[PDB]
């Protein structure tokens, strides 16, 4: 429940420490954790809110000009001097102008012309700093069992901040899922400014928001801002040797939108800003989880399929059943079978054990299960009343392993070491792989990692030819680097 | 550009494709994609649905270009002569008729 | 401005085609409008500024 139709969910089946299992949570999908004798839990990361951010260096992306003025002195004097040249709210430009004996001063050298114009701003955009402290994560988890397809004690919500990295989700009757997370560690926020222009917000690398050629204030503005640059938005063009003209460039808000590419969008409610794409890593202490359905008597009245048995995207099968009798809370018998002569359990039943908890007249419940690849029968019931359904699955185990490798490769391309931490109960091969991946990833990010989908595809093809024809061990070195870059790209 | 009242439409993982009636209007930009659907959202099946979104387009201002034939363009030449003119009549264009 | 041809034809912006008469028609509303989608469960339409 809550992760049936997500289409980007992965199963963390397995727990070999009898205890905590590491899991990396992403905004895209969610994680179903199934243990040996413990109920299947679906865990999802929902929203990342940021609060009380600190304004830093707002730029001015639209200028307005004002009362221009100018002066010129004859070709043999000092220099032209507007009194508004000692005002830090005016842009002043000095040049040489053809002058003499026609303009009024007898000599024929070049004059000196100064022009000053007052600067005004409209529509500035501002950036703000995100400290590692004071950003909150909200994780929603739910449990399988008795919830029909449509205080709950089967769902819980956990708030996690760097001030409280660990919390327990109290599932009434199932115990409590302890949950430790690395919130400071999970997405670097020590390089990301929160950027707003006009009711639109982004996450921006703190190196793209310092190499910007636009008039910039510093910090918050008490009153009318003082902008230091006075250029790169005001253009002093020159007439054919006799005049100066001052123009402003228009509103800049379409170039910034295209300068932003690969920057994450966000949204804002009041002093808080919700990011909808993040990455968090949690260890799941599932040792206070029980089963709410052992020591129950088998339900023996009848069962009716209420919708149909449906197939999720990953192969599993969801079934929604209605119970006719009134036996109180009682256990549901269900299995995947072939050869209905000898009912032999084939496949695996994802839900832990399906127990009906509401007994008034008719109850509804939803379970799901992982059937084998051939034809099979969903068998729900005990004797002479076991309604069954015919169900067919598509692909052999080889295709499943191939898709698993593809998913692992994509997760690696997205995360790196934290991807190495996804299913890490924790051994020595895992930690060694994570270490070597850390070293190689640091080197690769240092050398490459300044390109976007085209520079790196070009360098990939180039070095691919190079390693193909160089005839050394550098053949293997290149071809490996090329596999890296080209998959990093084609993942998309 | 400026945008206006959006709308959208979705379909079952196995139905046709979404269709807003505002796709037959040349004032709306419309885009079609695939969305995860099923059993929570409203139809029993689990594949990818089809979602269409449309929005009305309006332009506050636009730049316009115009063509120039090499005819119907005029040049204006000013010429003057030396001799008797005093220095005042160098940058003075008030009466050249007489 | 004075502008060359082939710079006033290779421009990726919504363009009418001459006599603006009644209700305006734009050949392309494409790229003046960005159709993103959320994590597989939404769609969002924004304009570039």
């Amino acid at each position: 429940i809550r992760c049936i139709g997500v289409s980007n969910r992965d199963f963390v089946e397995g727990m070999s420490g009898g205890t905590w299992v590491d899991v990396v949570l992403e905004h895209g999908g969610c994680v179903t954790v199934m243990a040996q004798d413990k109920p299947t839990v679906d865990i999802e990361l929902v929203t990342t809110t940021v609060s009380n951010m600190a304004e830093v260096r707002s730029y001015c992306y639209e200028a307005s000009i004002s009362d221009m003025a100018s002066d010129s002195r004859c070709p043999t004097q000092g220099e032209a001097y507007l009194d508004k040249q000692s005002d830090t709210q005016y842009v002043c430009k000095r040049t040489l102008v053809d002058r003499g004996w026609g303009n009024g001063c007898g000599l024929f050298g070049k004059g000196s012309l100064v022009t000053c114009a007052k600067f005004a701003c409209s529509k500035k955009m501002t950036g703000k700093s995100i400290q590692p402290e004071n950003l909150e994560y909200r994780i929603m988890l739910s449990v399988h069992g008795s919830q029909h397809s449509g205080t709950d004690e089967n769902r819980a919500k956990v708030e996690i901040t760097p001030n409280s990295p660990r919390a327990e989700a109290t599932l009434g009757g199932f115990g409590s899922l302890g949950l430790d997370c690395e919130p400071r560690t999970g997405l670097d926020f020590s390089d990301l400014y929160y950027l707003t222009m006009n009711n639109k917000h982004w996450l921006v690398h703190k190196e793209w928001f310092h190499d910007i050629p636009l008039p910039w204030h510093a910090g918050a503005d008490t009153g009318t801002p003082h902008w230091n640059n006075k250029e790169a938005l005001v253009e002093f063009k020159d007439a054919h040797a006799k005049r100066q003209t001052v123009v402003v460039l228009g509103s800049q808000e379409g170039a910034v939108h295209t300068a932003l590419a690969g920057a994450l969008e966000a949204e804002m409610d009041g002093a808080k800003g919700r990011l909808s794409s993040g990455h968090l890593k949690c260890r799941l202490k599932m040792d206070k989880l029980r089963l709410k359905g052992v020591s129950y008597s088998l339900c023996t009245a009848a069962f009716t399929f209420t919708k149909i048995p449906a197939e999720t995207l990953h192969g599993t099968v969801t079934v929604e059943v209605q119970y006719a009798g009134t036996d109180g809370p009682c256990k549901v018998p269900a299995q995947m079978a072939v050869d209905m002569q000898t009912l032999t359990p084939v496949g695996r039943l994802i839900t832990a054990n399906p127990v009906i908890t509401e007994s008034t007249e008719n109850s509804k419940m939803m379970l799901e299960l992982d059937p084998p690849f051939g034809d099979s029968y969903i068998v729900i019931g005990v004797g002479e009343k076991k309604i069954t359904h015919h169900w067919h699955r598509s692909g052999s185990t080889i295709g499943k392993a191939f898709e698993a490798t593809v998913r692992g490769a994509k997760r690696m391309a997205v995360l790196g070491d934290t991807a190495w931490d996804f299913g890490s109960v924790g051994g020595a091969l895992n930690s060694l792989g994570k270490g070597i991946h850390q070293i190689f990833g640091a080197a690769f990010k240092s050398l490459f990692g300044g390109m976007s989908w085209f520079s790196q595809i070009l360098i990939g093809t180039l070095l691919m030819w190079l390693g193909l024809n160089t005839k050394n061990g550098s053949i293997s070195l290149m071809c490996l680097a090329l596999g890296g870059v080209l998959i990093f790209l084609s993942t998309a | 550009a400026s945008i206006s009242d959006m709308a959208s439409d979705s379909r079952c993982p196995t139905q046709g494709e979404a269709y807003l009636d505002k796709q037959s209007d040349t004032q709306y930009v419309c885009k079609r994609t695939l969305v995860d659907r099923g059993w929570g959202n409203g139809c029993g099946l689990f594949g990818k649905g089809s979602l269409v979104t449309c929005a009305k387009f309006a332009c506050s201002k636009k730049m316009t270009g115009k063509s120039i034939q090499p005819e119907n363009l005029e040049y204006r030449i000013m010429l003057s002569v030396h001799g008797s003119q005093h220095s005042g009549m160098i940058v003075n264009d008030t009466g050249h008729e007489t | 401005w004075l502008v060359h041809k082939e710079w006033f034809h290779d421009i990726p912006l919504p363009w009418h085609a001459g006599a603006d008469t009644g209700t305006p028609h734009w050949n392309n509303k494409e790229a003046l409008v960005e159709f993103k989608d959320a994590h597989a469960k939404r769609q969002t339409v924004v304009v570039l500024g």
Epitope: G150 | M6, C43 | -
Partner: antibody, heavy 121, light 109 residues
Framework: VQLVESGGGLVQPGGSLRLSCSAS????????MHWVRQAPGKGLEYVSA????????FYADSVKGRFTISRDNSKNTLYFEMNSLRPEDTAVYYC???????????????WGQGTTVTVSS | SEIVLTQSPATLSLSPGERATLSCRAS??????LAWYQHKPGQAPRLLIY???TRATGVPARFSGSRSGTDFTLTISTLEPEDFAVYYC??????????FGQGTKVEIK
């Protein structure tokens, strides 16, 4: 959890009216809102809807073009600006609200008391 | 075009204590997404059943719902005096063109 409707009144054909529906007791932003009307001697008719976030809106063919639904999540208010009214729009209007994580879908709803709109010549 | 719902009898005359049965027929396949509402004059319509069998919060147990293909049934076992009202079915399938049935009135016989 309640919805208080207001703004209904008698108006001439072709008149413009604005109906309001104030929500209380829940997170207004997470609820998809709908307008359902009932003419005298007729069954309930589902005419309009808007998502929780205000992104998208739906109008039934019987009202498509003349009526405009909107919402303000800060003031917790749903608005149904109905223009070009006709005598066929004389009915009791109810605003309903349902918890939605998808554009308009909802399971358990909440209804207001309704407001009468009379369009007589 | 749009999905339409048909409520068979449009009027049900029964006495307090009898068993009431109302049917709703859909024009096309809707899996279980049917809702039953009770409407009394002078009161807002009250949601009784959603998902065609699940009783809303606080609804008494005497109301039951059943489905078979496109035919949905609302059953009232023990008719009560306050149970005499109008009853509507509403289709909740996949998008808003959502519609109600013409309604069936439960009248005292």
């Amino acid at each position: 959890v309640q919805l208080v409707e207001s703004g209904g009144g008698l108006v001439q054909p072709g008149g413009s009216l604005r109906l309001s529906c104030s929500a209380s007791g829940f997170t207004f932003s997470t609820y998809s809102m709908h307008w359902v009307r009932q003419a005298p001697g007729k069954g309930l008719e589902y005419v309009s809807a808007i998502t929780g976030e205000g992104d998208s809106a739906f109008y039934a063919d019987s009202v498509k073009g003349r009526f405009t639904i909107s919402r303000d999540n800060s003031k917790n208010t749903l608005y149904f600006e109905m223009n070009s009214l006709r005598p066929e729009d004389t009915a009791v209007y109810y605003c309903v609200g349902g918890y939605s994580n998808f554009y308009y879908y909802y399971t358990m709803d909440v209804w207001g008391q309704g407001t009468t709109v009379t369009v007589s010549s | 075009s749009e999905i339409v719902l048909t409520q068979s009898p449009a009027t049900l005359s029964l006495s307090p204590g009898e068993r009431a049965t109302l049917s709703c027929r859909a024009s096309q396949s809707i899996s279980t997404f049917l809702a039953w509402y009770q409407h009394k004059p002078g009161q807002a319509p009250r949601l009784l059943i959603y998902d065609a069998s699940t009783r809303a919060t606080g609804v008494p147990a005497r109301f039951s719902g059943s489905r078979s293909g496109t035919d949905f049934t609302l059953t009232i076992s023990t008719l009560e005096p306050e149970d005499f009202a109008v009853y509507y079915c509403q289709q909740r399938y996949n998008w808003p063109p959502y519609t109600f049935g013409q309604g069936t009135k439960v009248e005292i016989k």
